[PDB]
A paper describes a structure:
Purine nucleoside phosphorylase (PNP) is central to purine salvage mechanisms in Plasmodium parasites, the causative agents of malaria. Purine nucleoside phosphorylase (PNP) in Plasmodium forms a key enzyme in the recycling of predominantly host-derived purines, catalysing the phosphorolysis of inosine to produce the major purine precursor for the salvage pathway, hypoxanthine, and ribose-1-phosphate. Crystal structures and sequence homology studies have distinguished two broad families of PNP enzymes: those that form trimers (such as the mammalian PNPs, Type 2) and those that are hexameric (such as E.coli PNP (EcPNP), Type 1). Crystallographic studies of PfPNP have shown it forms a hexameric assembly suggesting its closer alignment with the Type 1 PNP group, although functionally it has been noted that, unlike other hexameric PNPs, adenosine is not a substrate for PfPNP.
Author numbering:
A (entry chain A), B (entry chain A), C (entry chain A), D (entry chain A), E (entry chain A), F (entry chain A): 1 to 246
Write the structure that this text describes.
Amino acid sequence: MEGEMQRHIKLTKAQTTPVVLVVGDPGRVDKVKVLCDSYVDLAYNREYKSVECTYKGQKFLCVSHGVGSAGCAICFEELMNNGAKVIIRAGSCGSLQPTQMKRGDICICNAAVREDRVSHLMIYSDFPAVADYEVYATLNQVAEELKVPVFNGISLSSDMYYPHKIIPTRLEDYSKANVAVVEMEVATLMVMGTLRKVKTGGIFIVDGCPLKWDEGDFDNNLVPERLENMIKISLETCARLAKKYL
Amino acid sequence: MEGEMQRHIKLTKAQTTPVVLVVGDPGRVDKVKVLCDSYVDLAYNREYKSVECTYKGQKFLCVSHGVGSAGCAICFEELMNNGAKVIIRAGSCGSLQPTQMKRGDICICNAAVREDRVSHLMIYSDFPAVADYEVYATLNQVAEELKVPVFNGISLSSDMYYPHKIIPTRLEDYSKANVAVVEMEVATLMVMGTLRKVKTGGIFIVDGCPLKWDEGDFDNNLVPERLENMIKISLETCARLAKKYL
Amino acid sequence: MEGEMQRHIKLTKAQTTPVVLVVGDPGRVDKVKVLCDSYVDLAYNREYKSVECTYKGQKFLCVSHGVGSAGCAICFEELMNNGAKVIIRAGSCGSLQPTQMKRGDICICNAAVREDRVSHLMIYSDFPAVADYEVYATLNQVAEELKVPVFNGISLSSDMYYPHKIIPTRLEDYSKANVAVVEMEVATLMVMGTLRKVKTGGIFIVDGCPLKWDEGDFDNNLVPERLENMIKISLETCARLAKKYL
Amino acid sequence: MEGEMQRHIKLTKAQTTPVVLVVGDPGRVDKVKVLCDSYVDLAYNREYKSVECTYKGQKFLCVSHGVGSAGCAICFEELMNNGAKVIIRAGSCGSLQPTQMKRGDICICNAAVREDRVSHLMIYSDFPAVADYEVYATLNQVAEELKVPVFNGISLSSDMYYPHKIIPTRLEDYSKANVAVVEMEVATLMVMGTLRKVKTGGIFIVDGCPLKWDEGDFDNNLVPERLENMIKISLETCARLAKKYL
Amino acid sequence: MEGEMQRHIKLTKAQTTPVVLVVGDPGRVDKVKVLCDSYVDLAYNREYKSVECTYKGQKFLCVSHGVGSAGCAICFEELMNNGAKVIIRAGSCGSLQPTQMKRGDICICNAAVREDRVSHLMIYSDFPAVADYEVYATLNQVAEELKVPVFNGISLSSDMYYPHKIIPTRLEDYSKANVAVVEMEVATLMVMGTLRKVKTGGIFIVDGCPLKWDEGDFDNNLVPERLENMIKISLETCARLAKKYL
Amino acid sequence: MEGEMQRHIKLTKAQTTPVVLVVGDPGRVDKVKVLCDSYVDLAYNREYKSVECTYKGQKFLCVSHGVGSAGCAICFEELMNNGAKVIIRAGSCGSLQPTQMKRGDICICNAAVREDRVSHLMIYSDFPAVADYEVYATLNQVAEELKVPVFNGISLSSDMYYPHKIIPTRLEDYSKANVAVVEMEVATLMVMGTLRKVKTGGIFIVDGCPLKWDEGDFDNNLVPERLENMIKISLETCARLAKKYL
């Protein structure tokens, strides 16, 4: 008898909770778990590190997915294979509204620009990348109760981090179209969610200013403390939803 | 001195309320207005019929936009030109989930498939067609308070009503992708909304079964009564939002 | 026993003549009909107003189709469903050759740029939007006999009326490509025509200068008189063709 | 002092008539010229063979362009560079309506499907490939006077002659869309014509049945005699138009 | 004074050798390094694990890049930022020629299908994904000297691992087009290489049969021994090239 | 009994050697053949002129294909139909690296940009246009032995020779992407090769400076002597490969 695991994340159905918090950095999993009530280390294969969190009485996984849409898609498909019903991406982003949203600001995302490939391999470009509206609402509610100021908006999910010389990026064009922030994974998660009837959402902390003006600190110590707040919102939200899902 | 009107809808800024309810049929405007507390007929040009509704103490317009994305886009741009802050499309749709959603069922829509052209003339296909999440939430809340059962889902907004022989439609493909309903305008409204910082949403009554099995009654007497309920939700929602917008 | 009607235009086969004149504005139907020998009001549903014209001994319909490709496509499919053999669009346009074609000038169109969606839902982009060459020839002949000066050229049929900020329109690019005028429907009509073996064409009066320089009068009183001439050419052409079609 | 020639066809402005008949096969130039009143051999470089025809009192060139859109485009650009005002393609095609149009039948073409690349390098796919309507009308008129039965229709201009195994051709799809015939050059000519204000058209003899059923004779002796008729129509048309162009 | 590192891989220019071997699995770095003469652990951040290999007298890095095109692109851009002149991807693949290439077989790749997004964000789809031909030649030469049988061919680089229900994958289509193997990263590497004047190539071991028939062993213990051979070829090749690059 | 020929090139299987040298200009065939040991004129139909070369003891064809991708594709498909195993394109090109590669310089090409249509009619754009690496290697080896300096690089294969006014060419963009040279046929050959398991490659002499600066001599006397060298490399390479293929 074997524990029958998913190929890449190496988790079984039985280890997989209804609710899963996903992060990009495997190093983020260890930081998240220290803020929980208790945890159980599960698996660490490739970039896919898995813990069971207990937080505010509730069990849910935290799982790292790596950088970028194709790599994270493998994580997300395998979690959904294992029965996940709710997946929330918690991460860093760049601000596309640099006068309004600065380093440290937190953005809760209802939808995303699909500048990947894998979503297009699932379904036609016309199809919207959209959060589940209960998951989005819950993140907002929790942030309000914790008195943590948040922005809401669309994310640009772009497979390109480093620009080349020949053709422009769409960072400015999407800023003009009122897209809030930019990162690399949430469109892929949202589309796959809708397609597989798994509820998804996204919360992000601004740690990058890819347009222009401002700041610092270089990174990824992100920012402290504003970072803690975003993680707490994430954990509180995951707990509230795992209650729905017993 | 002239009252300075928008070219097609023939309304002035001063006549345009923060909240506007949009319908496809100019004949629907007259049906909506009879369910209000009071109304003022405004203008009727081309397919664009305009009334000011008073309902539950609040003023907001009801405006017809005609069939199809390019024609309704003219309506919507001109309303936004005049200062509309909230536009809600209330209409008929076909069911893409015919085992689950039948004639008479009401669907409140958070997002849409962009099978138009004009949204693509505004912004790249990758960009999501998405409702404002406050508008979506308010429609749901009102429906719950009125004890009217509702579905939630994505709409396919397709410029094609009558299929041709050569290439398939994507009606089945989008059904498989868990798209709830199909109509012809809401993607165009949602994208333009996001682009112009105008809050939008969509509520629809199933009056068509474009896949296959079922029913009737032919149309558009729609259905009575279930129709009344959808209109009431619309009107109640518009009132609740116009309160926010004094 | 019912008179079995098309869903949107509400006309029966028996009411539908071989030749149909289509206009955008339902208000235009009433203006056209006053210039005929006699008429019979048929139906008025949504933006679709229908009259039978008698002009110079011949019977043919005048039918309004509303603004924009998806809405007019419903009109045109339903007319073709009812046996129409010839459909001519008579309308307003903008000049893309503003030094050459001014307000009041009339353009008879042999082909169009397909900047819609619905034609692309019928057939691949490579396929030409083209008038029937008998219909085009007849409009020219009638104009010559009536000593009304006309231009000939390609129309840009664009689903976008109001530009957005992010991506350019192709109005200038198509001007450089020697496209004469711009409107919103005739490409859709032409493609559907070819596909369904229905003869089509387009005549337009310049009432807009969307590039730049010039003029006036704002609109849509169009222009008088030059407007009358375009309508007369339309009516004379429809009569000449209905003779072919007894 | 040099006679300043175009790079590929090696003709000067002074040698280039307002009207030019173009054929694919350089061997066709020699066959055409024997049916004229008199000729002057001009140049033969690469696949580009050039003669001045005199026919029915009028001078015009016959020029070979080779097989396929990119090669013929070089011919056509260089002729237009030299002042050609009218270019007519006279050639062979396959029947896409094999019940209606058989080997030997002649088709006069008003428009074409753009299944090339070079037209797309000139202008967006939405733009129609269309004959000048005077050139099309003249071919028809001449055929009628010569009592030669002709078909009229759209041509599929396809860069692919030999199909591969992986993706289908659009031969059947375009047959279903009522495209008459298939060849390899006329879309490219038509678009370039419109773009450069040069009047174009196409007449073709069915020598191929690429769908299926029928026939023979293998080719390219084409067919005799029906072939002569198509060439005569071509020559007569070229003469009639060169008269317009003194 | 800081050692100035690349953001994600956390390596400095001074730590970065002209030649770099890239692998997907950070666990593969530890397996590679045990087969070298000596090593120096450098950095481990996110999925990016870095060692300096010494093998056969020569120094070159081995660096993990994670699963999938967008994540690995960050690795590759940062290595090129640091002066890498040669990057070779050594990994696992699936066989697209399952009668010819089986589990354990090794394929040296000269080119790839670009089924990513990020390469398309760099340059137009028309642009070829191609290995440097010296790097490809060297891998072949080394394999021949080591008497290790190898296949040569094109790789399909696909961002999709798990298929969805709505639209087909192109795995079969590309098999029919004589594509050898399928993996997820090498197209992205090849294009970026050409664009930045960095020499690239790919060697892969078949550990997957995504079409159909065959086998086993499940994975990723890959296969032993055939795996060792592929790694040895990789290491020998890297050494031979680092000699060129002192 | 007939010698059963391919439709356009008019060659039989028995006349077709394993190795074929292809040139654009039928006039080039006569120039090539004079540099061989002996030849046999085979066929001359349309732009397709065919000779059997004997050079350095070996037999292989030289065949002209005309200008441009669709016309040459017919040549290449028919040669492959007849059993050709190796086809090498030898021709002229323009320099896209005008500081580095000048008139007279010779470029041996491993890959190409697919700016045709016919390759896209065979297979999806993502698929690479790539030379066989043995053919590429052999051209290089022969050039080295003959002490003829050569460049190596990617070719832009573009169906457009004469630019139009509306949309830019990609000549500069591809120069920035490190594409070496530009011509009109080799991408089409490479893709078809891979698809049909026929080994291909390309060698070119710079006779054009389509960017800008420089030179002369106008053309196509190309250049002497540097031209002879490129032809000799071609012939030597063809001989070396025909030896492999007895």
